[PDB]
Design a protein around this ligand. Sequence first.
Ligand SMILES: [Ca+2]
Length: 508
Amino acid sequence: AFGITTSSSAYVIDTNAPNQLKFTVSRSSCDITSIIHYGTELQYSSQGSHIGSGLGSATVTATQSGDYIKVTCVTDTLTQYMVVHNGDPIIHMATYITAEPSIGELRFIARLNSDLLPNEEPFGDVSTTADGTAIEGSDVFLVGSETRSKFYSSERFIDDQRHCIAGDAHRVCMILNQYESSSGGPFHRDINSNNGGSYNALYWYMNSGHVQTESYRMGLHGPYSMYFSRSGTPSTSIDTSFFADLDIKGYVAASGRGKVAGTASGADSSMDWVVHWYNDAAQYWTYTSSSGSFTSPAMKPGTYTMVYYQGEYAVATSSVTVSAGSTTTKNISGSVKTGTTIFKIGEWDGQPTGFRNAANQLRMHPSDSRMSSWGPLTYTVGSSALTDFPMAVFKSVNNPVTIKFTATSAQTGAATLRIGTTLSFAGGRPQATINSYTGSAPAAPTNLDSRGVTRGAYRGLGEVYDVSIPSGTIVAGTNTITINVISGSSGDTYLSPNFIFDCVELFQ
Ligand SMILES: [Ca+2]
């Protein structure tokens, strides 16, 4: 029956779902210590499913409110909520924090039986590290001759509404429709799952220091929902509005929110467009339609910075204020301006899309034998394909990148060489030489203090470096550009200073 079974050590919650879903919550730690779905135990027996690596000790309460049951777990700076609805095989959750956990990241981890749930969705075994030997830190491994990492299960948050682990008789998915308290914007990605050898972990990283570009946000994170199925795959359309009636700390209901609607215009129509709003309390985003129209998700009231991107490249920024129960009409427009182009490598989309190894880099390590050669490579404009230009240059692997190009007598005037990047590591930035002219050495970029290119990520601060080329330096005929990555830091192979390319353009 739908209900709560109380024992001195735990509360057992029965959702009364058709295919059965009951779970046990420790009254001492708030760990989920047992999960029974369709008569089968799914929880790893040696360590619980919980926030972080466990709350350790929490004050736990459980109550029924109509067709809902709420379990609340209070600690000094974090309150964890689990809510179930009679008849649904779902553990809905929300996590309220007044300070970031001591570890410096906020995650929920379900440690589930890997014999029953061996697979990872939607990316497969790229994040299966079971039987692997570490090749980088304790997070990238070699399984046979293939590189693997929990990071290779990652996805851009704007596109990560569902990820799961599964087997032939059970599937467990996270349904994520509320990233407002996370950090890093729509293009932040993070660890989603990892079959590591003892169990298969299913995660929601609410925030972390993994290629983090923003400060953390306090308040209520989520809701998020963990759905249990036999062989079905749940839709991401899951109503969690009932949280409004459960006195959930930090929960702002639909009635307390407003929206921003308008039309974005001017950017590159060959790219997807995204509008993003943020302030110290919350972040929101939406794709626009092909006509540029958009409507924001329901937003907490306040004043926000508003950004318009083509791909992940910001073309315009503005400010807007939202009030509860109202829609603020606000358009936004802009475009990427350069000049008369002599040559262009890649596109201004804030990504290394199209470059050599870019697709593989999201799902394997740069040292994987399946990667194409990193170089040093020579790209010749007019002959080389974009997949011959390295997605990244590392001071101690493929430095420098050489570009050869032909100019006409009409192109020998002053020009600007623009080297756009997405993410730096260990102070890497470009210094360019054009024929016998060397540009100045830029200062080191802001250090994000995080591995990234070796862990399937590329969304950094997007530093762009311009080099002014005087008239008469470009010559009619063949010209040579050398891009060296410079830095006072050092590292072994892919951990040497480096940066990922966005686009290189020479214009006048
Ligand atoms: Ca690009």
